[PDB]
Design a protein. Structure first.
Ligand SMILES: CCCCCCCC/C=C\CCCCCCCC(=O)O[C@@H](COC(=O)CCCCCCCCCCCCCCC)COP(=O)([O-])OCC[N+](C)(C)C
Ligand SMILES: NS(=O)(=O)c1ccc2c(c1)[C@H]1C=CC[C@H]1[C@@H](c1ccc(Br)cc1)N2
Lengths: 394, 394, 394, 394, 394
């Protein structure tokens, strides 16, 4: 009975186009806040952040006021979209096809005219995502809210601290914070401020998943490529081992491609690491070909250069701590024996070439081991957030 | 004739903004229940549960009452969306872009004013999905429903047991249950309860599919990696076998990647199993390289260390139960015979090195077999739901 | 002039909320039929059938009647959505986010009040898809239609045979039929029937595509795995051939994964066939390792067991139809000759071990050939729809 | 001033439900045409054509006429959707979830009452796509337009030639033409025609992309499989080469799968070509195994059959244009010499078996080369649109 | 109070169908501009450009004017969609399913009647994307805006320079510019211009990403294919190396396929480069087979042709700077010695054939190296935007 009377009375002559101030010259203060419930996606290709957010607006409607003594029991009223004035606060940097992502809920008012509007939404905002340090990258995404058409002398936008009590932690992104700031922009024409409220979402990429799917597989496959330098040449499998390791890295690249960013503004950190690892596997195959050249050197070819015999068989090999009828029968038998002696000399020459091959495998083992470790440590620790990341995620 | 008169009479002065109670001070009891028809998806990346659900609301409208004697034949009426008051019960933790997923069906009322509202919908709710024990994981997803704007003294929300008679069993998830609970939240300002109804969907992952696509392939490929230790070195195919098995696991990883979860909150169980299996295949290739080093050992190199000949050729080899002119012609022929004797001594030394290689293959066969079995059994049975899962799904 | 007058007259006092019967106690008969134009998708993961369907409803509106003599030329009228009463027939088991998939076309009425409503739509219905016999599976998907709120004493739903004259044959599914049935459900409270009309779409999976992309490739790759038993051991390529065939099957699995169903309610038929084929390829690699063990057996090792020489060299090998100074020079020359004789004896022993290896390759060739044929024939012909399928599709 | 007066005057008593004819017995002629701007997609799995099309409708509204002398300056008026009568022409075979894909633009009318309606849209129509001759296939997709509810005596649909001046050429489909035809369907009840306008889009698949991604790669990989017959057996790499070529074709199949059609109504042309090529690569591996059997034939095994020595070493090999103390020392030395002579005889036998292997490689080289060329030429030129396609696209 | 009075006064007798000019014969000038915020996607398959754009329209409404002295404090008013007249400017070449992508914001008017309309939107326009020079391609995409129904004598469209102050740089596309142009089209019927405003977006593809994912991997894998010519034939791994490199390129093609364009209007630049590289790897395998033919040439076969011994062993080999009882014992021993001499002659012949094989590997090394460099440099530098691209992106 009383709310029937009240609802009839409140909408008599009410115009939802009218900003509800007693004095049209005075501004209408609107309190704007938000509540972040979820980070949904960070699209680095489309440069868009998707978030679950409940916006919180509050103001005072001069017309929706009543004496609670004349309508006992009726402390609040609800108005659906389009029936009363609402602040036209929109996300300026919206990247949604609808532009307005909010679900228009009812406006709750109490007897004194204080209106509360709690529109939920799944927002999509344009955010520049810098993947230079991927996967140890920290992103700062702005959410800029403001009145589409009212200036600061008509709509006095005020900010309140964002609520994160209901935030559901993301599995891929760590929320550093959601700080907010009120700013005013001025047009050179006029002296009216134009206010906006910007919330800067700072979020850190969790790196455990990437540690086990990109960093480790690349270290361990790189190690198996170094194993070629320990395989004896007589096996006849050095090329098989090395070339098949390279193939495994190509097949690996397929898995890596689904999670690596596709940009041309910079070479990500992990792209420098993956490329580095594959040049070292490629160069190990190249060094293996040279080693086989030495091992299979034809004994009747070119005599071991003097420099080859010094730089390898002496210096490097030390540093590495390696180390009538009767007369006719005589002629026939002297030929057989001399043939065998020539074979022995040829085999001795081949043994020197084979030992040189061994020495080059140990030099390359040592050099490639050092070079892989230096690149791995240097590339990963060049990230400013490496230490913090590993400490928090591992 | 009579329903024409009745429909005209029921909407005279009716305001769909008005909560329909005779006393505005008294609360309006709303009975809320749901009916779960289908679990559609459990998105562990976006942390969203999609379900097919028919909500069931009931209340009493003080204004929609008529004497069935004055309108014979007219026992019920139907009102479409927006024509009469409805409870504003919404899914609080909705993750839908529309926020409100319900299809607004007609409200059925009978002569005494009892209204039944059966809105169907495909709901998307935010649910934290813990994949620590994947694929033997049990998930608990909450569905929290409540009035958007009414407090407990105006809208007295009451719960009824969820209906699962129409539930269609899912092929991927086993429905443990859908228990419900009514709760009240209080603001420190005031003494009015704010009620909500939460339905907790508990669902168990069926593991048969994962048993045949991840667990078994990994066991059987791991077994083929152990086969390198049985392959004789003279084949010249040990590295080929072992390295190609590793490649097959990389290609396998591709299939596994489509179904494995991508999170950084924990290493899933199956990720520990897959990683474990691949370190053992990688280490078998490493051990094979060492074995080939022994088998192709140069006979004129370093004499078998004393420790090598004891730790291997004696202890391990026992535990494994293995085991003028005439004088000139004399000189020419004595050289030929002595050359052959030197060859025999060299070949005998090589045979010892080759037998040592055999012994290391049996040690590694035994050790790697034990270590694969222990890791497989230990990793899979570390799941609290392993026994139950295997009993129900296999 | 006349239709202007008529349209004005027909909507005077008309209420689209009113069921249009002269007697509110009498039921309003609605004739319901459908027309199936296309099967669009059979989602076995989401358990949803998508179909192109034109629904056909007919009833009689007591109020939309006119004398065609008083409005010459005006034989029919059209009313858009919301202007006149319509039956609230909905798909009960709808799996669409909109729930109502129909496009609301105009209601055509003639002078006697007979209304025809032909709403088109792309419907999504929840259908349990049993993939036990994939790809020789027949599916039965129900389409249950009924009034959302009217009981059988108010809305007398009647069925007519579904129209399939306009059906466009699907490339993946063969339409067996679309039989319909009217049923009544009773509540224990009351004696009013609640009718519904269910159309059961029976559709058979066409198997030609699967015959050329899964069945054949698996037979032919399985055959190439058997070819290892024909490759002589001296090639040094048995392991290479066998292990690379297994890899090709893993790469094949990738193609197969895109079209195989992902369920845990049963192991599909094709999953049993693919698994079977890969265990036999895996076991051929295992048998090859054993064969190489025999072929490279060290001649100075363990004497061929007595049982080995009988079970293989005799029985299986028969069944398979296989089969001063002068004296010093004497000593030097007698050693050379005796060394050669020892070599010949050692080589003879090795030849027996090599022939045993040959015999095991023929046994395994024969056994594996038989076992592959039996599994292929047995697994595929275990499908109840195998004969029919092959006869209609090949 | 004048258009204000005119707009007020034109909608006085206007009913948008009324077909706007002075005589309700006379039909209202509607001129229907379309303008094709783009072919967007040809979905052969879902059997749907997506096109960008601007429909063009024209008619005469008897009520929207005014004297341009009484409203100077007002030559035309615009009416938005729902304000005036429009023809209910819809795409009959629409495959869109909205069914009606048009964007409802304003209706332009001039002083004489001639209305022009230019609704744009992205249309989805159901088209049977026959991929028997893929990628040399020509498709004919119908677009059938008609009034949903009006018969030919009320709405006289007339056709005009489709406009293709604004057509943007597609990169995948060549537009042969868009011919249109007006037809009338009769119901046996009645003598009123029911007209429709059907536009048949004929489009030819461009084949350049498929020439470089499917046809060529398959020819060149097939050639590399033939290279096994030129590789000498002593390399020990024939199986490696052949088996790795087969693997490369499996990996190739992956790329081919993304662009090949998935149907069971026929085996496409390119599926016959790809299958053919892979049976020939598979059979080359089989023939290689036989060749190795000959090359490694044990010299102490079965004597070259008489037929083998004739069919190969003579006929095929011609067609291919190939081609006390002292006495003791005598005994010791006579054994050494006789041992060597036996070795020479054994080696001579082996040389015959090795030459037979060479002859079989040349026969197979020649035969497989011929058979690959015949299948390639025969399969591709069996397409009725092959010559035209290659001439226009290459 | 004053804005309530004003809003009531402004909509008295206002018709949003009326073009708001004091003189219906005079045109209404509309100022049209846009603001480009983001390039979202360049779909070269669907030929569609997606952009984030805020349109800017301005005009003068003759009816929305008021004296600011009679309504103090009320300087501006806002009107939502449908309440006042708006220009019907649409994107002519829209490729959106909605056709109209704008979000209809409020129209801001001031006391003098100047209306500002700032509709945001995510636009999809049809743009022909020429990928002939991919990835060094520059695209020109037009955005054509105009009134749907008004001619130039009723709606005088005027252009203003596009605003790019808020443009967010894209990671894949470099914005060269957004120049605009006003044009008039005439119908031969009449002398009224029909104006439109076209904005031509010129954008350059950034090539850093493609440099590291397509250009480099193809160079480095091509280099590893050249390494076969340095591998000695005795290794028995030349075919293994070469054939596995080809496989790695096939697996590589998979990654390349996701980013390469699929068109039949031309062969892109990168498709010519990738094809070129793979023909050279294929031909290296072919040349390797020929080399092995020489190396394993049977010594008792065909004598080195005279031309072979000149073209290779002399010219090319120079250019490349390469280079009673007693008598019985005599007979037995003379046979042994002569057997060895025959072996030496046979081995000498084989050495010539093996040296010829070496010479062919160096010729092919040199020739293939030159041919790879020429094709790489020639194909990439044939792009008109190569120099500029590399200078700006690397
Ligand atoms: C058509 C396809 C090919 C079909 C068949 C294989 C062709 C090779 C075998 C026949 C040729 C001769 C031969 O080698 O015979 C062998 C025996 O022969 C058998 O007993 C084997 C027959 C069954 C083969 C099963 C595997 C299918 C091959 C996979 C198909 C993959 C297809 C993939 C296509 C995409 C051995 O030769 P032999 O000289 O007889 O024995 C020595 C006798 N001795 C010891 C007594 C002296
Ligand atoms: N996606 S996953 O389940 O996290 C997954 C699956 C397999 C796998 C890993 C992760 C990595 C984590 C540890 C081993 C490492 C990788 C690997 C690479 C080379 C060698 Br040698 C051995 C092992 N194996």
């Amino acid at each position: 009975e009383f709310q029937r009377k009240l609802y009839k009375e409140l909408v008599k002559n009410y115009n939802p186009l009218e900003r509800p101030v007693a004095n049209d010259s005075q501004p209408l203060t609107v309190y704007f806040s938000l509540s972040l419930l979820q980070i949904m996606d960070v699209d680095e290709k489309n440069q868009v952040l998707t978030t679950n957010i409940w916006l919180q607006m509050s103001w005072t409607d001069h017309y929706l006021q009543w004496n609670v003594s004349e309508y006992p029991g009726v402390k609040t009223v609800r108005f659906p979209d389009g029936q009363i004035w609402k602040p036209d606060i929109l996300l300026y940097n919206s990247a949604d096809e609808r532009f307005d992502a909010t679900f228009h809920t009812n406006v709750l008012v109490n007897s004194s005219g204080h209106c509360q509007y709690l529109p939920p939404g799944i927002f999509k905002s344009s955010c520049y995502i810098d993947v230079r340090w991927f996967p140890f990258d920290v992103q700062h995404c702005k959410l800029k809210f403001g009145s589409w058409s009212y200036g600061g002398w008509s709509l006095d936008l005020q900010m309140q601290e964002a609520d994160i009590s209901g935030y559901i932690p993301n599995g891929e992104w760590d929320l550093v914070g959601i700080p907010g700031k009120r700013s005013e922009r001025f047009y050179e024409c006029c002296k009216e401020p134009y206010p906006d409220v910007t919330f800067t979402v700072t979020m850190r990429r969790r790196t455990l998943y990437y540690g086990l799917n990109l960093l480790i597989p690349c270290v361990l496959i790189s190690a198996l490529a170094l194993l070629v330098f320990l395989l004896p040449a007589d096996s006849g499998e050095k090329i098989s081992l090395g070339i098949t390791v390279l193939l495994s890295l190509t097949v690996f690249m397929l898995l890596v491609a689904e999670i690596m960013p596709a940009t041309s503004d910079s070479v990500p950190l992990i792209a420098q690491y993956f490329a580095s690892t594959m040049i070292i596997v490629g160069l190990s195959v190249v060094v293996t070909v040279i080693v086989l050249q030495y091992h299979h050197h034809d004994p009747d070819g070119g005599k071991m250069p003097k420099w080859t015999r010094v730089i390898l068989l002496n210096w490097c090999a030390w540093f590495l701590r390696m180390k009538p009828d009767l007369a006719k029968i005589l002629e026939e038998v002297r030929y057989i024996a001399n043939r065998f002696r020539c074979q022995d000399e040829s085999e001795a020459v081949c043994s020197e070439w084979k030992f040189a091959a061994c020495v080059v495998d140990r030099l390359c083992l040592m050099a490639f081991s050092v070079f892989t470790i230096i690149c791995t440590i240097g590339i990963l620790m060049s990230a400013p957030n490496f230490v913090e990341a590993v400490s928090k995620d591992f």
